[PDB]
Design a protein around this ligand. Structure first.
Ligand SMILES: CC(C)CCC[C@@H](C)[C@H]1CC[C@H]2[C@@H]3CC=C4C[C@@H](OC(=O)CCC(=O)O)CC[C@]4(C)[C@H]3CC[C@]12C
Ligand SMILES: Nc1ncnc2c1ncn2[C@@H]1O[C@H](COP(=O)(O)OP(=O)(O)OP(=O)(O)O)[C@@H](O)[C@H]1O
Ligand SMILES: Nc1ncnc2c1ncn2[C@@H]1O[C@H](COP(=O)(O)OP(=O)(O)O)[C@@H](O)[C@H]1O
Ligand SMILES: [Mg+2]
Ligand SMILES: [Mg+2]
Length: 1145
């Protein structure tokens, strides 16, 4: 598959051992900063040393040029008989050239091999780091999943590209100094002035690199922030669109984008300055050297000395072409390795089945979240943990798993055994349903079918495209919340471990599915296997089945024992429980984004600059043909104009790139957020966030440099061809054969590169997805103790990706070799033609010296052209989203028709409403009719899939209405603008979507609310005390996803977010699914006493809540069966609502 030397495992072992030695060295000194750079040096130096050796040989074979040009010019002008003959010299020059290119390609080969090995090793290192880092890093804002993915995607690759270019950073100094010494030999002391001019590049480039590094660090910071915001928007589109907050968040993202673009503009300015200095300092050096020689050495330059000197100046200039690129990549790689080294130095993890004694545990802050934890989990018996929101239940489970640092106490596990964890927030991989349920276990049809039947997944999976073999999770078909949770519980049940930790598996399930699970999946299956079970549920009706009961309050265990033991000891708690139970074209578009003034300005300026440079060389040739005021003046003005045009041409391309990036991202963002919700439901979030992150990174930072280098190289090559044709006209005859060869080699390689690039992309997306899915749900992987299998999967995937990239690099080597040999042929033919058929001795020198140049710059033209193609692909994709369908915000109803207080009364009339999500799909609602009075408390109930949530989203026109009316306060919502409808009605969704920032930001992003009303809403939502206790009060931070809070607390925050708006109609959709009964009862009482005037429709998770309601609706497959008061439905014999009440109680 891949040679043992290039397997990721061996390179990883080497790098890890070197890094561990560096860690020991750091431990010794107070510096205490293990350095990745030295570890990489020790591990992978010898390859780079070999590459440097090859490059140093190539440099001498390059200096071979000036000598032969001198000899040929001298002989055309006027033992060892073969040595001087011009044709013999030309043959020798061709041979030396091919050998130099061979050595150069050898160095490039060694460096690419080492870079790929090091990328594999580093990905392995940071992956093992992911498998070791503590979740308290992601929970407290120390880092994010986005940063962990950014490392893998951008920063490792940037370091790899830098390693590709690494040898230059010391080979170029050597070559420049050697050229200066030889120039001294030729030109006397006059060459030392030019030597000083050239030397001044080192201070200049160091300063420019300092500024570039500052700018790049700022750009990376702002890009991370911008992508954080964009990812949150893409994930929470549903809530943002329902609340009409889309544009506020879009504006915030645009502000961060403006800051990032300012940083990018500073970086572009200094990159343009570096290019300008690199190009100009040689022109100034030539001017100074030759003026000084004219005025110092009375003897004029004979043609031989002159053309040798000009050739040496070309040899000096050739390395300077790359210097800007290498400084760019070195600065970016320095920042990347700083990030990687920060990541790799972070926080890491430190009968009775499980007993905890005097356990104090904390979530990393250093303050105990649990205290005096004295518990025991009896072996082979069901334990049930019961408590109100935020009482340390999930915390207790994770503490037993050892996921949070222990301040005191011990845990005994009569090393940890594999425990089956079904986390409260279900986590699914990107494999099929069968792969999620089996989760690395031998398939057994009997057990698989039993578990699937227990979790009632069979009806759901046969409705999927390819039942039991459909790609689930991100990058595949999405599943409803209940489906995902039941799949996760099925995964937990199917494994053959002995301890099963189920953290609230009934949150999304309805009464029927929940009861079926509780009976068949747990009480029967797990007891038949005699497995220990620990349940964390608010379903107090199941306490009769429990064998051991743990009661938690305010982080500490209040009481523990059997039900009878609790009744005997703590009568209060048992009585409380009983009371609670009631017992291409894209390239042209990118270029045109400038507006036809910057594009044409750029092209014209670059043409003129290259013309002036070649004119400088021609003037030197003619001047030394003299063998004077006029010549010095002409030379000086030529050089000055060259410098000026260098400056202009340096600025133009970078400005074009800045503008293109800004416009592309702005269009993408604005069009994406306006799209219909169906688009986000259908398209995986990956296919959008990738556009926003990776393609945007390309368009911002990779296209402008590639384009500018491409233009420089191509214009140098064309200019050399023109100068040669002027020197020897017959060369135009030989131009056609070589051009044909060029076309054919490029044809073949371009198709090959397309194919291998497709392979590389297809092999890397699974690797990034693996890093993602392991970063998330880390606790699950470490609970099943499947870390070894995941390490193996990572190793094999990275080996596959490395094989793909190795083939791509081999194709690059093929084309580089072919084109370099074509250039060598060009040099040989041009030298012969100039020797035999040129008019003046000066012309042959110019022709030969530009023949030398074509070889180097043709390779760059080819390589940069291919890179520009692959990079324009992303512009093609980002622009593609500009084709999307956009939701109709216009609205037919006139603004004057809409009152100032539209939902003043709150009455709604639903007339023959029928709704479906996409055309040619099943109508989920069927001729539903409703009449809710103003100031009416309605309760809607039913089984999952009855269309309650469809009816809820109908009010906000998030579901397409085939036929019907929804008349709210006398206006058909279809006529109104979308935002006036979606802003004057409030809805509480079941799944809490909480953004990063303060409590204020989540409660009121617009900051249009006084703190008093925020406190009021928090008090209604039963969170006033917790927020008061928090360090910052209403300014306290919320991490991404609200992970620093409990799930129930997240839902309560989502309730406060709706209570603040204070509209007249409130659609609460199963909002108390994750909230416990104790909190839920008081919350409902307070909401009824507070919103008594408004109309509230509550899609209820438990019918006990809507037992007290003015009106009750029961849905069944989109049909309203019964429409009356709860008393009437209860008194109906064999009614549906009565059965619901019996089951729930
Ligand atoms: C002029 C001739 C003789 C050689 C042309 C290249 C060289 C001048 C070498 C010597 C000094 C080197 C530079 C000096 C140090 C840096 C800064 C370095 O980035 C940092 O030091 C981090 C930023 C910071 O210091 O805060 C990136 C490479 C770079 C530009 C080096 C690139 C290669 C340079 C320019
Ligand atoms: N990931 C976390 N990082 C840091 N602190 C946390 C984290 N999760 C919860 N906390 C803190 O732990 C305390 C206890 O919450 P815990 O996570 O144990 O909730 P829970 O009782 O299992 O939740 P619920 O019953 O509402 O589902 C909360 O006050 C919260 O501040
Ligand atoms: N995002 C969606 N796209 C298309 N169809 C959906 C979507 N969500 C649910 N449905 C379909 O609508 C029907 C009712 O779903 P839903 O409204 O979620 O019921 P509930 O009232 O239990 O939430 C189901 O049969 C399901 O197939
Ligand atoms: Mg919990
Ligand atoms: Mg629903």
């Amino acid at each position: 598959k891949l040679p043992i030397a290039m397997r990721a495992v061996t390179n990883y072992v080497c790098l890890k051992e070197a890094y561990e030695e560096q860690k020991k060295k750091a431990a010794d000194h107070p510096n205490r900063t293990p350095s990745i750079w030295l570890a990489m040096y020790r591990a992978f130096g010898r390859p780079i040393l070999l590459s440097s050796t090859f490059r140093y040989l190539a440099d001498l074979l390059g200096f071979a040029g000036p000598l032969c040009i001198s000899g040929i010019v001298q002989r055309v002008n006027e033992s060892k008989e073969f040595l001087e003959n011009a044709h013999v010299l030309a043959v020798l020059l061709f041979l030396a050239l091919i050998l130099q290119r061979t050595f150069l390609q050898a160095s490039y080969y060694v460096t690419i091999e080492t870079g790929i090995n090091l990328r594999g090793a580093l990905l392995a290192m940071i992956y093992n780091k992911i498998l070791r880092l503590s979740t308290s890093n992601l929970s407290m804002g120390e880092m994010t999943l986005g940063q962990i993915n950014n490392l893998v995607a951008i920063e490792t690759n940037q370091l790899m590209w830098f390693l590709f270019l690494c040898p230059n950073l010391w080979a170029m100094p050597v070559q420049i100094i050697m050229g200066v010494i030889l120039l001294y030999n030729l030109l006397g002391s006059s060459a030392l002035v030019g030597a000083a001019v050239i030397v001044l590049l080192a201070p200049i480039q160091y300063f420019i690199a300092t500024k570039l590094a500052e700018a790049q660090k700022s750009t990376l910071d702002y890009s991370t922030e911008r992508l954080k915001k964009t990812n949150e928007i893409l994930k929470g589109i549903k809530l943002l669109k329902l609340y009409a907050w889309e544009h506020i968040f879009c504006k915030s993202v645009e502000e961060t984008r403006m800051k990032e673009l300012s940083s990018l503009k500073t970086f572009a300015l200094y990159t343009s300055l570096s290019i300008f200095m690199n190009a100009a300092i040689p022109i100034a050096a030539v001017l100074a050297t030759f003026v000084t020689h004219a005025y110092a050495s009375g003897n004029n330059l004979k043609p031989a000395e002159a053309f040798a000197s000009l050739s040496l100046f070309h040899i000096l200039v050739t390395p300077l072409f790359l210097l800007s690129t290498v400084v760019r990549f070195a600065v970016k790689a320095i920042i990347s390795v700083q990030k990687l080294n920060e990541f790799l130095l972070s926080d890491e993890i430190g009968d009775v089945a499980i007993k905890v004694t005097n356990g104090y545990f904390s979530w990393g802050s250093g303050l105990a979240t649990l205290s005096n934890i004295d518990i025991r989990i009896p072996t082979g018996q069901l334990t049930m943990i019961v408590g109100q929101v935020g009482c340390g239940k999930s915390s207790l489970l994770l503490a037993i798993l050892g996921e949070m640092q222990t301040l005191e106490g011990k845990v005994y596990w009569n090393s940890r055994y594999s425990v089956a964890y079904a986390a409260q927030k279900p986590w699914l991989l990107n494999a099929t349903v069968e792969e999620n349920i089996t989760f690395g276990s031998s398939f057994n049809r009997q057990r698989y079918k039993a578990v699937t039947d227990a979790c009632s997944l069979q009806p759901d999976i046969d409705l999927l495209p390819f039942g039991d073999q459909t790609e689930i999770g991100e990058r595949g078909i999405n599943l409803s919340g209940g489906q995902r949770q039941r799949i996760c519980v099925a995964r937990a049940l199917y494994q053959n471990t002995n301890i099963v930790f189920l953290d609230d598996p009934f949150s999304a399930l309805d009464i029927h599915l929940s009861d079926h699970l509780m009976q068949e999946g747990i009480l029967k299956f797990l007891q038949d296997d005699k497995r220990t079970v620990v349940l964390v549920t608010h379903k107090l009706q199941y306490l009769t089945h429990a064998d051991w009961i743990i009661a938690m309050k305010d982080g500490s265990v209040l009481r523990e024992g059997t039900l009878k033991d609790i009744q005997t000891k703590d009568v209060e708690l048992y009585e409380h429980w009983k009371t609670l139970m009631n017992r291409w074209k894209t390239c042209w578009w990118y270029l045109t984004s400038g507006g036809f003034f910057l594009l044409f300005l750029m092209i014209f300026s670059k043409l003129l600059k290259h013309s002036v440079i070649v004119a400088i060389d021609y003037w030197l040739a003619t001047w030394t043909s003299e063998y004077q005021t006029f010549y010095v003046a002409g030379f000086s003005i030529l050089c000055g104009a060259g410098i000026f045009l260098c400056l202009v041409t340096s600025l133009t391309v970078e400005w074009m790139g800045l503008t293109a990036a800004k416009n592309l991202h702005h269009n993408l963002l604005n069009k994406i957020i306006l799209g219909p919700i169906r688009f986000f439901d259908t398209t995986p979030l990956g296919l959008i966030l990738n556009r926003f992150s990776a393609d945007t990174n390309i368009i911002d930072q990779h296209i402008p440099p590639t384009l500018e280098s491409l233009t420089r190289s191509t214009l140098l090559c064309l200019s050399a061809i023109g100068m040669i044709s002027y020197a020897t006209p017959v060369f135009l005859i030989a131009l056609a054969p070589l051009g044909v060869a060029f076309y054919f080699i490029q044809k073949y390689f371009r198709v090959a590169s397309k194919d291998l690039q497709e392979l590389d992309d297809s092999t890397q997306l699974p690797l990034l997805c693996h890093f993602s899915e392991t970063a998330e749900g880390l606790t699950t992987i470490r609970a099943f103790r499947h870390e070894t299998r995941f390490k193996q999967r990572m190793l094999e995937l990275t080996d596959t990706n490395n094989i793909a990239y190795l083939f791509l690099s081999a194709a690059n080597r093929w084309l580089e070799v072919r084109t370099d040999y074509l250039g060598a042929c060009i040099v040989l033919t041009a030298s012969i033609a100039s020797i035999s058929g040129s008019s003046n001795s000066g012309l042959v020198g110019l022709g030969l010296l530009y023949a030398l140049t074509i070889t180097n710059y043709l390779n760059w033209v080819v390589r940069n052209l291919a890179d520009l193609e692959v990079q324009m692909g992303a512009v093609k994709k980002v622009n593609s989203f500009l084709t999307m369908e956009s939701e109709n915000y216009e609205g037919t109803m006139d603004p004057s028709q809409v009152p100032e207080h539209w939902p003043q009364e709150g009455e709604i009339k639903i007339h023959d409403l029928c709704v479906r999500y996409e055309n040619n799909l099943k109508p989920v609602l069927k001729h539903v009719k409703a009449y809710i009075k103003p100031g009416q408390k309605v309760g809607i109930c039913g089984r999952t899939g009855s269309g309650k949530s469809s009816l809820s989203l109908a009010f906000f026109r998030m579901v397409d209405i085939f036929d019907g009316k929804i008349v709210i306060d006398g206006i058909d919502i279809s006529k109104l603008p979308l935002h006036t409808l979606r802003s004057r009605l409030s809805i509480i969704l079941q799944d809490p979507i909480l953004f990063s920032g303060s409590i204020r930001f989540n409660l009121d992003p617009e900051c249009k609310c006084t703190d008093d009303r925020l406190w009021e809403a928090l008090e209604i939502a039963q969170l006033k005390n917790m927020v008061k206790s928090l360090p910052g009060g209403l300014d306290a931070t919320v991490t991404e996803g609200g992970e620093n809070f409990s799930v129930g607390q997240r839902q309560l925050f989502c309730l406060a977010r709706a209570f603040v708006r204070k509209s007249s109609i409130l659609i609460m959709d199963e909002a108390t699914a994750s909230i416990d009964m104790a909190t839920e009862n008081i919350l409902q009482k307070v909401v009824m006493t507070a919103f008594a005037d408004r109309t509230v429709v509550t899609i209820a998770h438990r019918v006990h809540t809507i037992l007290t309601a003015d009106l009750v609706i029961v849905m069944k497959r989109g049909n309203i069966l019964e429409y009356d008061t709860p008393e009437s439905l209860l008194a109906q014999e064999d009614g549906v609502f009565a059965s619901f009440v019996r089951a729930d109680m």
